[PDB]
């Protein structure tokens, strides 16, 4: 009274509408994704504030975990959506802004657009349950840390296994409670790698003024800050395998 898993279910932020004026230049479309992505990330912040145990990490580890994991989150969420909504077929960023095969033909998109689908693809391969989903999503936040760990190391440490626990529970719903974990922690692994791409691009488009690509205040602030930190490659992807 109540389960944390059910608490998870409730805090998960509502799907966002893109407000896209759908009458199609590829600068614009990506500019829009960015505009959307900004609010999406703002929403993930409240969601962080209301994670159980998040407030008693240290402000710096709060910043830090978000800042490093933020793409990992949005890309993951986008996978889930694109799973639920077209069972893998299309990228469904917002109900109003869906990328069918057709919009991938658009100039520079495809590349990224294929590696976003890969993420959805993995939901389709593993047939992930919504509870299973939420669980990892939380983990993903706690999976991208500095090479020289944390400003409140101990605290994190417990939390991490806490939510891994919760992922147990999730598949507990036989001979799976260590067995399916492999298939699913393998995913949590392969994220770091697939995010890697999207994360880069994003970077490229950010510093490369003469592309006319627009990013909103929120994200600017974080990319422009996370830039050098990721230059060094001074970021530890915590895996399982």
């Amino acid at each position: 009274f109540p389960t944390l898993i059910s608490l998870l279910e409730v805090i998960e932020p509502e799907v966002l509408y893109s407000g896209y004026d759908s009458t199609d230049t590829s600068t614009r479309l990506m500019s829009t994704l960015n505009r959307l992505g900004g609010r999406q990330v703002v929403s993930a912040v409240k969601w962080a504030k209301a994670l159980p145990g998040f407030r008693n990490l240290h402000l710096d580890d709060q910043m830090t975990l978000l800042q490093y994991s933020w793409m990992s989150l949005m890309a993951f969420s986008l996978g889930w959506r694109s799973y639920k909504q077209s069972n893998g077929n299309m990228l469904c960023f917002a109900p109003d802004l869906v990328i069918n095969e057709e919009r991938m033909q658009l100039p520079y998109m495809y590349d990224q657009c294929q590696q976003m689908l890969k993420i959805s693809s993995e939901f389709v391969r593993l047939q992930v349950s919504y509870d299973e989903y939420l669980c990892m999503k939380v983990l993903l936040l706690l999976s991208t840390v500095p090479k020289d760990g944390l400003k409140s190391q101990a605290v994190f440490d417990e939390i991490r296994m806490t939510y891994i626990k919760e992922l147990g529970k999730a598949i507990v719903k036989s001979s799976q409670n260590w067995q399916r974990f492999y298939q699913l922690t393998k995913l949590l692994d392969s994220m770091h790698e697939m995010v890697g791409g999207l994360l880069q691009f994003c970077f490229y488009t950010f510093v490369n003024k003469s592309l006319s690509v627009e990013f909103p205040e929120m994200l600017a602030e974080i990319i422009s800050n996370q830039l050098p930190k990721f230059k060094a490659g001074s970021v530890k992807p915590l895996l399982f395998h």
């Binding site: 962080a48 504030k49 910043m63 205040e217 602030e221 422009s224």
Partner: peptide, 13 residues
């Protein structure tokens, strides 16, 4: 300068 908005949301006051 760590990021202005992201910070304020976590700290307030």
């Amino acid at each position: 300068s760590r990021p202005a908005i992201l910070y304020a949301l976590l700290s307030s006051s």
